[PDB]
C-alpha cells in the first residue's frame with residue numbers, strides 16, 4: 001500500500017502539470033554561454049550560466065527547421081511536455097523552457113560528472129555490485145515513468161549522467177511518450193532496440209525492460225549483448241533469441257538477463273502479471289534496499305572527479321558554433337504549444 005499510495009500521488013502531481021504545462025519561463029539573454037557539451041543533427045547541449053544567480057545549467061537548443069525536416073516535431077513536444085511534468089530523484093530536472101524565432105530551449109540541471117558511458121569505457125566494466133547500484137535506480141525510474149503511462153525509449157549509457165553523489169540522472173527525453181496502449185515509431189539506438197521495434201510491431205513499455213537487460217549486460221561485460229559492426233547484423237542477433245554470457249557473470253545475473261532479454265514480449269520480466277516486482281524480487285537484487293536507493297542513503301560505487309559546478313572536464317570537446325536567432329519567426333505554427 002505504501003508503494004501504491006506513493007505512485008497514486010506521483011500520478012496526480014504529474015497529471016496536474018501535464019494538463020497545464022508551463023511555458024516561456026526564461027529567455028536566452030538571461031544566460032552566458034560557456035561550452036558546447038554535445039551536438040547532434042538537430043540540436044546541441046551547452047553549459048550556460050545564469051547572469052543574475054550565477055547558477056550553471058545544461059541548455060538543450062533545438063533548431064526548429066531541422067526538427068521539422070527530421071520529422072521530430074511530436075517528439076520534441078513530447079520531450080518538453082513530459083519533462084516539465086515529471087519529478088523523480090533519478091531524472092534530470094527541467095528548470096526553464098522557452099522558444100524564439102529559430103530555436104527551442106530546454107534549460108536542465110547540469111550534472112558535472114559526465115556520462116556513465118565515459119566511466120564505463122575508462123574502467124572497462126563495472127563489478128556486479130556497481131552495475132546493480134545503477135540498475136536499481138533505472139528500475140525505480142521505470143516503475144515511476146510506466147505508472148504515469150510514459151515509455152522512455154532511449155536507454156543507453158550515454159543518457160545516464162553521474163551526479164556529485166555518484167547517483168544516476170537520466171537525460172534526453174527526446175523519444176519519451178505518453179502511451180496508454182501501444183505505439184509504433186521506429187526510434188532508439190540500434191544496440192538497445194527490442195525485437196518488436198525492429199519488426200515494426202505495435203509495442204509497449206516492455207521495450208524499456210528489454211533495454212534495461214541490454215544496459216545491465218553492457219555495464220557488467222563492458223560491451224552490449226548483440227554487438228556487431230553494422231546495424232543489420234545487430235538486428236539479426238537481437239531477433240534470434242540467442243545471447244552469450246561471459247563466464248564471469250554470476251548465475252543470478254544470467255538468469256535475470258535471460259528474463260529481460262526475452263524475445264517474446266509476453267514472457268518478458270516487467271511485462272508479466274507481477275510487473276516490476278518480478279525484477280525487484282529477483283535474486284540478483286537480493287542485496288538491494290529499494291527504499292534506501294530511492295532516498296539516496298546508499299554510498300555510491302564512486303564519486304566522479306570534478307572541481308565544481310562549472311567544471312566541464314568530464315565532457316568532451318566540440319566545435320563552438322553560433323546560436324543564431326533569425327529576424328523572422330520560423331515554424332511558429334508547428335511549435336505553438338512549446
Ligand SMILES: NC(=O)c1ccc(C(=O)O)cc1
Pocket residue numbers: 037038039045058092108109110111112161171
Ligand atoms: N543535464 C546535463 O548536464 C547534460 C549534459 C550533457 C548532455 C549532452 O551532451 O547531451 C545532456 C545533458
